[PDB]
Design a protein around this motif. Structure first.
Motif, mmCIF file in Angstrom:
data_model
loop_
_atom_site.group_PDB
_atom_site.id
_atom_site.type_symbol
_atom_site.label_atom_id
_atom_site.label_comp_id
_atom_site.label_asym_id
_atom_site.label_seq_id
_atom_site.Cartn_x
_atom_site.Cartn_y
_atom_site.Cartn_z
ATOM 1 N N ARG A 338 0.679 -1.074 0.016
ATOM 2 C CA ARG A 338 -0.041 0.010 -0.103
ATOM 3 C C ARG A 338 1.070 1.195 0.069
ATOM 4 N NH1 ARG A 338 -5.586 -0.829 1.210
ATOM 5 N NH2 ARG A 338 -5.875 -3.201 2.125
ATOM 6 N N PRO A 339 0.494 2.486 -0.474
ATOM 7 C CA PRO A 339 1.019 3.568 -0.307
ATOM 8 C C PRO A 339 1.350 4.257 0.952
ATOM 9 C CG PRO A 339 -0.947 3.832 -1.814
ATOM 10 C CD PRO A 339 -0.930 2.343 -1.309
ATOM 11 N N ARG A 340 0.502 4.052 1.732
ATOM 12 C CA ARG A 340 0.504 4.433 3.300
ATOM 13 C C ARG A 340 0.171 3.404 4.203
ATOM 14 N NH1 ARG A 340 -2.016 9.696 3.734
ATOM 15 N NH2 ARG A 340 -1.286 11.323 2.100
ATOM 16 N N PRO A 341 0.975 2.249 4.151
ATOM 17 C CA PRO A 341 0.569 1.488 5.147
ATOM 18 C C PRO A 341 0.608 1.533 6.531
ATOM 19 C CG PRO A 341 2.726 1.017 4.578
ATOM 20 C CD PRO A 341 2.372 2.212 3.879
ATOM 21 N N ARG A 342 0.880 2.678 7.056
ATOM 22 C CA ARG A 342 1.006 3.109 8.819
ATOM 23 C C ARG A 342 -0.503 3.900 8.833
ATOM 24 N NH1 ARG A 342 6.628 3.151 7.692
ATOM 25 N NH2 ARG A 342 7.436 1.253 8.932
ATOM 26 N N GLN A 343 -1.428 3.823 7.754
ATOM 27 C CA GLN A 343 -2.723 4.397 7.997
ATOM 28 C C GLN A 343 -3.559 3.130 8.602
ATOM 29 O OE1 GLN A 343 -4.980 5.723 4.591
ATOM 30 N NE2 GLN A 343 -5.509 7.410 5.575
ATOM 31 N N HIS A 344 -3.375 3.113 10.033
ATOM 32 C CA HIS A 344 -4.213 2.246 10.680
ATOM 33 C C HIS A 344 -4.313 2.556 12.002
ATOM 34 C CE1 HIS A 344 -0.992 0.176 12.910
ATOM 35 N NE2 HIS A 344 -0.088 0.298 11.737
ATOM 36 N N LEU A 345 -4.938 1.768 12.933
ATOM 37 C CA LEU A 345 -5.474 2.106 14.235
ATOM 38 C C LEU A 345 -4.918 1.191 15.212
ATOM 39 C CD1 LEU A 345 -9.367 2.731 13.693
ATOM 40 C CD2 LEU A 345 -7.483 4.558 14.032
ATOM 41 N N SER A 346 -3.996 0.201 14.737
ATOM 42 C CA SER A 346 -3.635 -0.740 15.822
ATOM 43 C C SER A 346 -2.897 -0.302 16.932
ATOM 44 C CB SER A 346 -2.962 -1.983 15.184
ATOM 45 O OG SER A 346 -3.617 -2.513 14.055
ATOM 46 N N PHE A 347 -2.122 0.623 16.685
ATOM 47 C CA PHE A 347 -1.321 1.342 17.800
ATOM 48 C C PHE A 347 -2.154 2.596 18.674
ATOM 49 C CE2 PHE A 347 2.525 -0.107 14.941
ATOM 50 C CZ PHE A 347 2.695 -1.070 15.648
#
Ligand code: HEM
Length: 404
Positions: A338-347
């Protein structure tokens, strides 16, 4: 169980651990995100609560600590209200949290983590060199628990041969008599005082030596910790151990399962091993090792057209928000580039966002760089057994075979 797609909205109770166990809970979250995304449940095994199911709403809650409190006094940070009296900084609001968190963030320094890489890699290498080839074994036991226990020993430069002590102290921290972990509150207290004594030896040995790259050296040489009491030291050490332990374990197991279920992504990863960097955050989104965190409202406020009242329990369902297609493109797909793979909520986000994340991601990166050099396939042999929890999204056992 009722059909998530059509049942009455007011019958939907997403906290039921069986739904995580059998991995159907996603269907209910899907129904809520579409039809009642800020969802009130008036009655459950945990009492009444709001479910926050969408990515932007969850961020709003997590980043508004002056409205949505983490304080242990209101029940803390899990849907299940909480019960040796040690400060627990995740279950604390401003101003106290901030000085306890600032002690520890040396671990966030990329500069510091870079010094640990060689130690991490040699330790991962040795485990992977010892795995049977072409024979079934439990990935959870042999790799995930083993490697996670290494990562914590690396963080504290804990005497490596004794590293099982860390996972014992982790187990004791959340145990209660009758569970078969500890037989009494005395035994539990006794073991955690043995932990404090051990870490105090370590501190005493390190405070007058040149500092290492480990946390205990760094805390001992840092002028910010002058006023750190022994209770704060022990509370910080146990919170790091617990915070790092099952999350990293389940991320280690989860990425194997994802790559097995998406063999095209595994083909792309072998063809371009550099994708390890953008794959590791995808693993973390896909697994969502902690499915929620909870808060308690301390003032009325509005969210999604709803009024959340002072005193109400508010559940941020990170697992749902990580499946929210209004933010994340094709969220049910495992995509390692993905282009922005840190766009998540897990942290999480906000003042309590994971402090361990850079260490977890480094550990996971080095793991997979070292898998890729050794094995052509990691084959899952049977559906893993999941954990029965609404908090931990994880795996108790997963049988695999590795192929040269
Ligand atoms: C993939 C692995 C991990 C995941 C998914 C994870 C997840 C989380 C979440 C969801 C939170 C609370 C976020 C919020 O409420 O906004 C948190 C906090 C925290 N985690 Fe992690 N974590 C992981 C690894 C680690 C590791 C390796 C460590 C320790 C070395 C760690 C230590 C902590 C600590 C101490 C906090 C409390 C931070 C604070 O309250 O300011 N975690 N984590």
């Amino acid at each position: 169980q009722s059909a998530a797609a059509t049942m009455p909205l007011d019958s939907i109770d997403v906290s039921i651990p069986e739904l995580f166990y059998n991995d159907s809970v996603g269907e209910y979250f899907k129904r809520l995100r579409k039809d009642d995304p800020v969802h009130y449940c008036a009655d459950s095994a945990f009492g009444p609560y709001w479910s926050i199911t969408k990515y932007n709403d969850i961020m709003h809650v997590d980043t508004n600590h002056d409205i949505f409190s983490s304080d242990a006094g209101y029940g803390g940070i899990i849907i299940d209200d909480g019960i040796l009296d040690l400060p627990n900084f995740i279950a604390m609001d401003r101003p106290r949290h901030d000085e306890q968190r600032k002690a520890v963030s040396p671990i966030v320094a990329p500069a510091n983590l870079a010094a640990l890489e060689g130690t991490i890699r040699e330790r991962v290498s040795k485990t992977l060199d010892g795995l049977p080839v072409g024979e079934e074994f439990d990935w959870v036991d042999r790799v995930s628990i083993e490697i996670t226990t290494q990562m914590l020993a690396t963080l504290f430069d804990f005497p490596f041969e004794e590293r099982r002590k860390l996972t014992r102290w982790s187990d004791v921290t959340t145990a209660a008599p009758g569970g078969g972990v500890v037989e009494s509150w005395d035994q539990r207290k006794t073991e955690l005082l043995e932990c404090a004594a051990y870490f105090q030896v370590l501190w005493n040995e390190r405070v007058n030596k040149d500092p290492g790259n480990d946390l205990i050296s760094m805390l001992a040489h840092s002028p910010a910790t002058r006023n750190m009491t022994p209770e704060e030291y022990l509370g910080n050490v146990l919170l790091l151990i617990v915070g790092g332990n099952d999350t990293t374990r389940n991320s280690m197991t989860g990425g194997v399962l994802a790559l097995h279920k998406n063999p095209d992504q595994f083909a792309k990863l072998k063809a371009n091993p550099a994708l390890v960097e953008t794959m590791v955050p995808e693993i973390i989104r896909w697994q969502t090792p902690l499915a929620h965190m909870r808060r308690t409202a301390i003032a009325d406020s509005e969210l999604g057209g709803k009024t959340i009242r002072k005193g109400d329990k508010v559940v941020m369902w990170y697992y749902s928000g990580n499946r929210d297609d209004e933010v994340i493109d094709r969220p049910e797909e495992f995509i390692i580039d993905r282009p922005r793979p840190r766009q998540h909520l897990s942290f999480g986000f906000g003042i309590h966002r994971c402090v361990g994340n850079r260490l977890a991601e480094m550990q996971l990166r080095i793991l997979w760089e070292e898998i890729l050099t050794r094995f052509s396939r990691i084959e899952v042999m049977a559906e893993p057994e999941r954990v029965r929890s609404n908090f931990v999204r994880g795996y108790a056992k997963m049988m695999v075979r590795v192929h040269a």
